[PDB]
Design a binder for this molecule. Sequence first.
Ligand SMILES: Nc1ncnc2c1ncn2[C@@H]1O[C@H](CSCC[C@H](N)C(=O)O)[C@@H](O)[C@H]1O
Ligand SMILES: Nc1ncnc2c1ncn2[C@@H]1O[C@H](CSCC[C@H](N)C(=O)O)[C@@H](O)[C@H]1O
Ligand SMILES: [Zn+2]
Ligand SMILES: [Zn+2]
Ligand SMILES: [Zn+2]
Ligand SMILES: [Zn+2]
Lengths: 828, 826
Amino acid sequence: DRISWLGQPMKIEENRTYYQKVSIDEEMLEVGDCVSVIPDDSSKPLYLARVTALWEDKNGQMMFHAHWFCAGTDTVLGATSDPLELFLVGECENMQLSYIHSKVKVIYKAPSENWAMEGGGKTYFFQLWYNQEYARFESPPKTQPTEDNKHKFCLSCIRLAELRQKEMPKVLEQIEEVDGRVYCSSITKNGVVYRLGDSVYLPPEAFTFNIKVASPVKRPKKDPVNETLYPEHYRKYSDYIKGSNLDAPEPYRIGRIKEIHCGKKKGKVNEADIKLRLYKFYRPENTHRSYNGSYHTDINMLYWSDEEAVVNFSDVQGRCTVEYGEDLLESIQDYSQGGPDRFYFLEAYNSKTKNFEDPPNHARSPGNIKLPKLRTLDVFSGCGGLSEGFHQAGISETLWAIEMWDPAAQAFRLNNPGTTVFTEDCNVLLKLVMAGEVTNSLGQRLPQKGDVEMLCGGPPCQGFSGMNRFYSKFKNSLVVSFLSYCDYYRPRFFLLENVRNFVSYRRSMVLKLTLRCLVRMGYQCTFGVLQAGQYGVAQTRRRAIILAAAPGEKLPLFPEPLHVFAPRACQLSVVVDDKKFVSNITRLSSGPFRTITVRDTMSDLPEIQNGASNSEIPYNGEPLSWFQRQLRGSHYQPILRDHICKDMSPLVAARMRHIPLFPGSDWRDLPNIQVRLGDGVIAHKLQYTFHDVKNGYSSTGALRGVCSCAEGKACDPESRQFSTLIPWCLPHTGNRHNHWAGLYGRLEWDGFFSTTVTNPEPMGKQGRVLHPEQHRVVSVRECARSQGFPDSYRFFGNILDRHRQVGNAVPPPLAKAIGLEIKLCLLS
Amino acid sequence: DRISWLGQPMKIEENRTYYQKVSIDEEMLEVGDCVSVIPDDSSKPLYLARVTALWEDKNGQMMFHAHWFCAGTDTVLGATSDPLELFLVGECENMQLSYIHSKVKVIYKAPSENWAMEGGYFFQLWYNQEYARFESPPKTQPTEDNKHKFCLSCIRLAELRQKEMPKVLEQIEEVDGRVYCSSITKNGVVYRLGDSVYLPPEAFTFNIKVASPVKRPKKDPVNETLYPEHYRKYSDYIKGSNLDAPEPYRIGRIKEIHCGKKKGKVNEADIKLRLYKFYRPENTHRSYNGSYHTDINMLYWSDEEAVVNFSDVQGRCTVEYGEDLLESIQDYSQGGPDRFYFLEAYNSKTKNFEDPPNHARSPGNIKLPKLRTLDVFSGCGGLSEGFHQAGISETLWAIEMWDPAAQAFRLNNPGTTVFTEDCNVLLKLVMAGEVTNSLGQRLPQKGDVEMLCGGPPCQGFSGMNRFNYSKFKNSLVVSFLSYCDYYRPRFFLLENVRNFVSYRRSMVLKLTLRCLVRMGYQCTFGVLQAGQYGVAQTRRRAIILAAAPGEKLPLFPEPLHVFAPRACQLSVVVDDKKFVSNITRLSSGPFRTITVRDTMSDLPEIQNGASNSEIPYNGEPLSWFQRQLRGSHYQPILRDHICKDMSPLVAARMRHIPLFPGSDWRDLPNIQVRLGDGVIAHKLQYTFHDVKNGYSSTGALRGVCSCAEGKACDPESRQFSTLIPWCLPHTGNRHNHWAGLYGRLEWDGFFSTTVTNPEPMGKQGRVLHPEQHRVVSVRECARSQGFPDSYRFFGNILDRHRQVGNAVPPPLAKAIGLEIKLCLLS
DNA sequence: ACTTACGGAAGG
DNA sequence: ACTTACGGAAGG
DNA sequence: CCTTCCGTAAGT
DNA sequence: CCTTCCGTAAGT
Ligand SMILES: Nc1ncnc2c1ncn2[C@@H]1O[C@H](CSCC[C@H](N)C(=O)O)[C@@H](O)[C@H]1O
Ligand SMILES: Nc1ncnc2c1ncn2[C@@H]1O[C@H](CSCC[C@H](N)C(=O)O)[C@@H](O)[C@H]1O
Ligand SMILES: [Zn+2]
Ligand SMILES: [Zn+2]
Ligand SMILES: [Zn+2]
Ligand SMILES: [Zn+2]
């Protein structure tokens, strides 16, 4: 209605008149309070904001600035949120007081000073800051208003100004202006300082190399496949090769900043358009050697060039460190392992000579705190792939572990000699500590409040695994059991791992309540899906990661990818209630390092026949790639362990011998032949005595059905065929299972593994488990190679037992990647 | 913590000590106040309830009765709901005072006495989770006896289950453990001896045993060179088919009622009924062939007996002997529901018809004001024609921007002020105080409108169009709500296509409902199948009902005709909460299904491209359905029985479509035809592999473009003027092989959704006559829509086709309107 | 025991 | 004009 | 429409 | 996987 100002205006500017208090419809309003307003544009029924400023413009209007809140429904929580709970966000507006519905009351629920020891009309409340882009619940900032700020204080305006000034490119020191163009010394953007002589990441389309690409050769169809010798090849019109890096992008371009120039705009320097001319760096796969010489070289070795190219400062992804070999005060192994984005070069590459030099002298550089490991409790430890990676980050000593499966707990003790491993049921053991008992029946000391500083685990996946056919279920579940451990112990850091479909299970409900509980605990928290193949292994393995940090700590961000990977497998987005959420990761284009492949994974292992049982055989050679050198160490070790194969049936064995070697091969290439096996057993041909209404007749007029369902009828028993080389069940239900692609399939050397399983079977849903050339299933060591386990890591039990230990495991590279991000928050 | 009573205790039962006030942890609680409690078994994070009783048990603890509330997110509204709005539910439980977290204050927000002239925590409505019905709260109030445990949830529960339970009224004689009765009741329906009752078709047999011999299957092999697209019919599905259609209800005449006894009293839970089997004309030896012309409510008496359970009783119907009637049988059957009649009787051994015995004979052997209704998006007027068929409203105003629909509306409504302006413009003139428009037509204003109805454009939500909050703020569905906001009628109807409540993941629905709750309107929604109300067309439409606070919210009409179960899936789900209408008839119904033969068997044979707008009937009506739309008065002239003039190539396609049920384009031969002058229809050439469909039986290919081999579509591969349309095998595999295109309806079948332009190569292209080589006529589309032959249209043949397409069937509108009638009484 | 035998839906 | 030409998702 | 992928139960 | 269905825009 009519709205009058209260008291003398405070901190008025020459063109804007801030006040202190106002009265709406005979109400009382002042800085600190909060206000409701009805929307014009959204599905929401009402908005809630916070007062900020109190100014009347010279135009005659009276407006005020408003720091909007966030209903729990507006967040990832949705309907499971607390209807009395709000969150702080980075939305802010300046608004006329006539839109004020009227005054609300929101109270700040700060975490207790005894927070780590707990866990045994309408009035709103807030406790944490929400960022809708990456779905991150963070503790609110602690910066305060001063004399300059008291009338304008808007935390959302400050976060916007600090972030935008951070993101803006800026020239720091400029050398000399020449005829309209000003040359620069040092520039910066996104908080990164760039100077002359630094190297820099650029996308692959930034510049080419002067060595001409070899692309004229094209591969036509080899021949028309016979449809009676190969009566199931017709199911391969897919033109899709599983686990192949043909669509894998090329890694970052790297150049040495020769010089920086730009332009002018309105008398001042045009910082928005900065140009960089660099010396191109040659990845070994960019020389005339290209990929076929790219097998033994390190992933961070480059080749100096004198070629030049001009690129925009806008395309700079980041800055990397590249040094010449002889100038380093330490080794190259200790230099590469001392930090990220660290490259090196020993020679130089001439485009015309196609030889390697001593690089010129203008490429040579100038001269031409004990970290406390965190006491960690690893629930569902398995073999310890998750805890091993955290150790590789050097941030944690896992003191306790819970693993009900016996072979997994034993293998865990083998690799962690200072961990008290419980084989109890996790909920049986937690109840023991709630009863006040010190040890279990065997005398193992139970961890108490204050002992564990980080809690991590990977609960069973078989419930949310998108492979198997078949509220208080969540309240009795194992993931809620893992949540009361964090509720009881109140650790400083929390990490939960599961398969990517963990956050789409039951219409995304399980995660909606998984973070719903952490925020009621006052925990900072966030989630996201990560591809293990982006962090050093040759396996597509998307796993959902839930991070959480105590209010006194800083919430970690997700690790940014190190290796490029096939794009169809790095789709890391997550949709919940039509709101798409992403991780804080900024590397989608490409990455610093080449993708890890199967040859970098297994090319050094000796040839074994199907059914290997020798648990300790010698290496007949030395590491053949950078990846193998990482897992075998540099110390002399001749014994290769766990390189054993499953003993398959003579029928299955015969099937694998007839799988072609060429990439993409699988069961659909098997011949319809008769082979006789061991003793007097005979493998029969497959009879096609039924019409396939959908698949029709063959090139030879033969039929393509093996049962009566192929004609639309009910499946008839006794039409089932046995001991066939072409398995009977795959053409049986192939039409509605994408022709069972990948089964009895081979990995390719230039490709990568699928998600490595707990039991490798060529006729299971993920059956791409044949060796690229050998007629055998993948061995236990080859699986942990694809899982990133060092060759020093040991497992326990029979062949199947140690297989499942590898399959259930978090890849240590993924855990090391995450672990490093947690260390960054340990500082300051 | 510590809980103490305060005040004198109220009336105390044998084991329960009622109190009025009590103090738990420094607060004081009175009956009628509200409390918050924390949940442990629901995904919802808090529950709120109003305290109704304050007793203390005999075991020692002190308890209280809590009538739970309904959060707006708990409802169909979900996240859009007003967050401080709650609704009343029939949920209640008794609990300890130890679970009380807080004491909330919720107040009743009643509609003002000046509520209809407006439009320029709290609770107001009652929510029914099963049917998604926001109703006004009950006016039941407490008296001294009930005031200590007064829970509206419990008396609505008690009256519900007691109306639902069977009960014996009048007992007769008790004989050796079995007591015979003369009156029983359930579901509020009283049953007496001599009455007839509905029962499922699985209730009893007939002594005429039906013949079902395995007629000839797998007749011949079809030449895949002559018919190279026949292989696409492996689905064994024919659309518009009534072979999976259930049988209507079984009807029998109660002659004796008996039951047992449990613990000395009657066992009303197990009541038995002995009936006289009634013979539908399709149950006699004539069967379906003989039951074509007979009424849908004529039965045949039989002395066959059968005993069935009273738990199987679906409803009561009234069956009278024909000659015992005081009126005609048309005045009788058109005078009420569930009304059947019989004139003869059927003997199953003799297999012909007698005159019924004397014991089958019967004993002797207020002007309602119509509503002033405004019909926005009137079209030709099919919606308000149905309302007038129910006799509940004279539609005085109407809005229709398309001229041929507004003209055709006036031709059928002579006393309606039809505005052809834009709906947004017209209300804007009412907002400015304008009396008339540019033409001098008086504008309706508040008070004049008693009912607002309309069918907004379906083109945005329809599931055939490809190119699908601000858009909601602009659209006509909110334009139609501002009319509801200004005039504030007593009743409100919104019609649209089924997926209106699935558009944008059910957000259009949740916002259409939320606005009516904010204006104080009772409201609900549901999906209805027009084929369940007397037409031979599957036409699922979402219906949104609303009622002023002072009125009573109507319920959805219960199906009158059985229909194909595949097209009557009326349930809708929004945010994984499945909602359904109040309909109770699912398996079967009172009347058989209306079929194509019942709809066009009387209309004369016409060639393709007819323009003769006024032709005579070739005889009399040939069914009950036609006799309803042609009237008892002598009318010799048939209107709008014209079909679209098709191209000579299209003309040749229709002639080559087999007449046997389920035929469509996939049966066309691949040959040449000589057309007008020297025009030739060229053959179709298969010069590409189809990697998904493989080779034929003759070794020929099944692809017509490079895409069939997985390549990019090659132009210059397109074939023109060929009998088998080139575009149909081109994109068939990812379009269900284009089932229905150039398809024929079945006489024993029903129409698909009759659209605005019948073209056989459209998405729904089974628009060919069951026998004639032509597309259905304008009248035949009006017959499938349930229009009387008395109804006039306007414009060209296309403008007429659109008028019948976008109209909502008057039968369905009549079904809804009768339910609105039952609220105007009492 | 071990080898065969096989839902979906969810995203894309 | 009018005859052809065809993306879905959402449910079952 | 096609591709994803820490599989289990029914068969013998 | 298979059926639903008050279609519209590209092209003659
Ligand atoms: N109730 C329970 N209590 C403790 N461990 C359990 C359990 N139920 C299943 N487990 C074990 O938990 C293990 C999870 S495997 C996960 C291991 C870890 N993510 C890694 O990287 O190695 C399974 O091997 C399973 O045997
Ligand atoms: N802006 C507008 N104002 C008034 N009518 C409109 C309009 N936009 C479209 N229409 C008309 O609304 C009509 C809906 S057809 C529905 C008519 C009615 N349900 C019946 O049974 O007959 C369409 O024919 C269309 O011409
Ligand atoms: Zn701001
Ligand atoms: Zn079969
Ligand atoms: Zn009650
Ligand atoms: Zn094509």
